[PDB]
Amino acid sequence: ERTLVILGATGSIGTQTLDVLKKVKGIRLIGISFHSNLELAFKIVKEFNVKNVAITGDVEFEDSSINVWKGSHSIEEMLEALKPDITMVAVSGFSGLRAVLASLEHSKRVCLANKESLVCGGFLVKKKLKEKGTELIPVDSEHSAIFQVMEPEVEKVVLTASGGALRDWKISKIDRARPEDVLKHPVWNMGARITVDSATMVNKAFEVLEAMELFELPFEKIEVKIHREGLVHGAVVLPDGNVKMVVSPPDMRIPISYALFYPRRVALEPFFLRTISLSFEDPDPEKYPAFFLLKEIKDSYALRTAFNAADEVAVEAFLKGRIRFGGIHRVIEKTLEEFQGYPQPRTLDDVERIHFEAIKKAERVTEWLS
Amino acid sequence: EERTLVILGATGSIGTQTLDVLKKVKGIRLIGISFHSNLELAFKIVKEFNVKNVAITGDVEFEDSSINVWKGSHSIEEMLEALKPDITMVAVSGFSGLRAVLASLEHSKRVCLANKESLVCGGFLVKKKLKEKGTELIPVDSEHSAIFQVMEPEVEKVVLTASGGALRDWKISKIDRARPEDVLKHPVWNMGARITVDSATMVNKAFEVLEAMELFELPFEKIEVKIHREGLVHGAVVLPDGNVKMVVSPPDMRIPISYALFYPRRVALEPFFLRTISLSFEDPDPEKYPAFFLLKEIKDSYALRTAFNAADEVAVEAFLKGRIRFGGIHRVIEKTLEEFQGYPQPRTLDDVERIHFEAIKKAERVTEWLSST
Ligand SMILES: NC(=O)C1=CN([C@@H]2O[C@H](COP(=O)(O)OP(=O)(O)OC[C@H]3O[C@@H](n4cnc5c(N)ncnc54)[C@H](OP(=O)(O)O)[C@@H]3O)[C@@H](O)[C@H]2O)C=CC1
Numbered sequence: 001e002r003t004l005v006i007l008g009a010t011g012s013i014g015t016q017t018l019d020v021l022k023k024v025k026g027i028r029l030i031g032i033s034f035h036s037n038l039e040l041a042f043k044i045v046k047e048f049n050v051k052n053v054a055i056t057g058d059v060e061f062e063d064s065s066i067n068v069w070k071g072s073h074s075i076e077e078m079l080e081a082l083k084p085d086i087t088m089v090a091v092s093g094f095s096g097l098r099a100v101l102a103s104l105e106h107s108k109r110v111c112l113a114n115k116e117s118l119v120c121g122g123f124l125v126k127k128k129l130k131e132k133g134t135e136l137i138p139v140d141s142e143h144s145a146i147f148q149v150m151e152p153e154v155e156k157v158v159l160t161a162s163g164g165a166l167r168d169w170k171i172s173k174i175d176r177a178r179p180e181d182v183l184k185h186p187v188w189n190m191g192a193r194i195t196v197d198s199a200t201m202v203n204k205a206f207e208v209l210e211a212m213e214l215f216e217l218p219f220e221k222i223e224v225k226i227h228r229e230g231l232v233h234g235a236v237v238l239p240d241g242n243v244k245m246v247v248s249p250p251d252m253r254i255p256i257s258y259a260l261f262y263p264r265r266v267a268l269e270p271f272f273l274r275t276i277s278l279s280f281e282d283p284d285p286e287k288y289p290a291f292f293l294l295k296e297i298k299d300s301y302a303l304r305t306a307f308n309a310a311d312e313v314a315v316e317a318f319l320k321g322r323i324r325f326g327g328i329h330r331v332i333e334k335t336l337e338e339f340q341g342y343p344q345p346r347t348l349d350d351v352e353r354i355h356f357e358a359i360k361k362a363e364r365v366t367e368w369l370s
Numbered sequence: 371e372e373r374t375l376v377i378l379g380a381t382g383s384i385g386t387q388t389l390d391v392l393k394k395v396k397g398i399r400l401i402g403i404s405f406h407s408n409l410e411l412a413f414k415i416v417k418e419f420n421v422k423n424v425a426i427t428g429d430v431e432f433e434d435s436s437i438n439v440w441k442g443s444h445s446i447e448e449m450l451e452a453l454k455p456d457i458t459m460v461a462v463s464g465f466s467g468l469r470a471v472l473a474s475l476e477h478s479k480r481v482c483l484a485n486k487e488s489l490v491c492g493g494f495l496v497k498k499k500l501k502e503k504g505t506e507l508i509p510v511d512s513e514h515s516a517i518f519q520v521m522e523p524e525v526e527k528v529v530l531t532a533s534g535g536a537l538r539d540w541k542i543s544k545i546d547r548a549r550p551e552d553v554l555k556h557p558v559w560n561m562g563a564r565i566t567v568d569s570a571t572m573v574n575k576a577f578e579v580l581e582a583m584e585l586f587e588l589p590f591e592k593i594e595v596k597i598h599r600e601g602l603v604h605g606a607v608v609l610p611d612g613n614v615k616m617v618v619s620p621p622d623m624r625i626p627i628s629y630a631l632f633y634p635r636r637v638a639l640e641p642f643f644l645r646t647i648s649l650s651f652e653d654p655d656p657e658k659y660p661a662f663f664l665l666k667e668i669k670d671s672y673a674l675r676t677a678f679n680a681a682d683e684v685a686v687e688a689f690l691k692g693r694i695r696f697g698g699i700h701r702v703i704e705k706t707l708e709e710f711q712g713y714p715q716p717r718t719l720d721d722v723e724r725i726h727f728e729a730i731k732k733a734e735r736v737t738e739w740l741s742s743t
Pocket residue numbers: 007008009010011012013014033034035036037038056090091092093095096113114115116139140141188189190191194252
């Protein structure tokens with residue numbers, strides 16, 4: 001059996017990974033990390049007989065027949081001790097950057113669900129990947145699809161987007177939208193943040209930057225289309241007229257299983273061909289202004305990190321009632337203005353300093369907009 | 371760096387589309403051609419491509435003089451032995467493609483296979499020669515090219531798509547009485563009279579299923595055919611996890627030709643741009659395409675597959691000549707196959723060629739019966 005560690009086991013991706021382990025044999029889960037959801041963590045440790053846990057938040061796990069690592073280097077120290085064959089990196093937020101770097105150091109394969117790691121610190125991940133040679137497979141549905149059809153000479157890589165919860169609403173009504181209108185979603189079963197991110201298309205902006213890092217694509221070779229039905233997860237347009245497309249049901253257990261079991265294909269449920277509707281349209285810049293900030297930020301890890309930080313602050317603020325929907329892209333825009341002229345970060349510490357300064361600035365902007 | 375090419379059957383549809391590709395991308399030098407009887411087109415290919423080597427497979431005069439000319443029944447094998455091309459495009463029509471593919475596998479580094487008969491009738495022979503030589507074989511057919519591009523060992527289903535042919539929207543009662551003028555109109559693809567009729571009966575698709583089993587080493591049970599009226603999807607693989615990989619492209623044979631010739635490089639032609647579509651996939655009606663549903667009966671026997679091919683060749687020509695109506699085609703095939711029930715599995719090229727010859731003779735007798743009746 002191949003040994004597995006799931007970082008962020010208590011989250012959406014984490015628990016879907018557990019579901020997959022019940023459905024397919026050949027991997028043994030030997031450790032998990034979680035942040036603060038102790039009740040769920042307890043269920044997992046009992047159900048899966050997990051003897052190694054890294055606590056990442058300010059919570060009390062005790063104990064006493066299981067090894068419990070706690071604090072800021074818990075993930076790193078657990079991974080060094082366990083040296084798993086496979087690590088699923090399903091932590092949310094900016095913590096994903098250090099989690100991925102530690103996973104690359106101590107695992108033979110890293111299954112990457114966390115987006116922030118490549119958005120903010122892709123240059124660090126790429127350096128570590130080259131040095132260590134660790135296998136890295138994306139878990140995101142769109143990058144899993146691309147991974148399956150990618151080749152060296154492409155004309156265009158097409159990512160598809162649902163258009164989010166407000167895809168149908170007209171422009172003037174979107175500014176005023178409340179949380180009770182953004183949840184949800186209406187295509188994927190995901191955490192509260194990702195749902196807001198799909199509605200602003202910030203999620204898709206992250207995926208473009210992730211695709212550039214993962215597949216060494218220039219910005220100009222990527223295109224994003226709104227695709228209502230959510231069947232096509234990615235397509236590659238080749239120079240000869242051929243297009244390779246990947247279709248599947250919208251269930252994250254599919255790309256999870258692929259990343260865990262590659263090069264084997266897991267037996268889940270085959271998707272049988274039938275008459276089908278495939279629509280592809282350009283995102284309207286007036287409906288998705290934060291998405292169109294990509295051109296402005298793509299070349300700078302300082303601006304990419306600030307983009308992510310401001311989005312984290314604005315979504316939280318939106319979820320807590322301080323701003324309305326139209327305030328999200330404004331917080332991001334106004335925060336980015338304050339980082340123009342920043343030098344390109346060179347180290348993990350540089351990236352971390354930008355992130356915390358940007359959180360600080362975005363909070364000030366949010367206060368103004370509240 | 372430059373690769374040399376021989377095109378067997380250079381004067382045909384595939385051959386001239388290959389020439390069209392060679393005019394608009396560099397890296398391949400045409401050094402030899404074969405043709406059967408189209409002297410006028412062969413000389414013009416020779417002049418315009420500066421070809422110095424020609425194999426004539428038919429009984430025609432091609433004299434002389436500044437070029438090397440091979441003639442008679444061994445002309446392809448002899449020219450290939452002399453030329454040793456890097457690539458041979460095998461685009462001869464009909465049963466002689468089996469001999470041509472085997473000859474090509476002897477003397478090329480890569481064989482681009484357009485000819486269907488070679489695998490339908492003699493797949494076991496081709497596979498044996500492939501193993502001994504270790505030469506590359508890339509299919510040129512657009513469905514096989516599509517599958518080649520997405521194939522992997524653990525597929526659940528390989529899906530070939532079919533236009534359904536000229537009579538796809540017709541009532542079953544009208545089909546039996548159809549004439550060549552009904553069939554020889556063009557729903558999705560631009561090709562010869564033979565391929566157009568085979569598309570209407572879906573015998574073309576029966577050939578492609580058998581070729582797919584040979585090319586990709588798939589059991590018959592893992593192949594699915596769907597009628598796909600848009601003709602945009604040329605093939606798909608269904609994986610056991612829920613993923614489906616599909617290949618979409620314009621219905622232009624220059625695409626898979628360029629892919630086979632230049633693999634692993636992709637030639638810059640005209641990129642296809644994604645847009646809103648419905649995509650239809652329906653099962654073929656057994657009552658509409660009876661000759662297609664003879665697959666399950668013939669699939670394990672090279673004797674039956676060779677007879678199926680021969681009977682088809684006879685029946686299609688008789689149809690085009692006005693001797694039988696469209697419904698007569700599947701009847702010629704069925705009745706000819708009934709005469710070969712129990713024939714032993716051929717073991718050599720010579721066994722295959724004997725079955726071919728007798729099935730042609732048997733199918734002609736059947737055709738006369740149906741014509742006079
Ligand atoms: N959900 C989806 O469908 C998809 C998600 N992704 C990406 O995967 C990542 C995780 O997504 P999702 O599972 O939905 O997120 P969730 O919020 O549902 O769960 C995230 C996990 O990370 C833990 N966590 C939270 N904060 C920290 C922290 N500061 N340090 C370490 N661990 C922490 C949580 O612990 P606890 O519960 O105890 O607080 C939980 O275990 C994200 O980057 C997301 O963009 C990508 C594609 C699709």
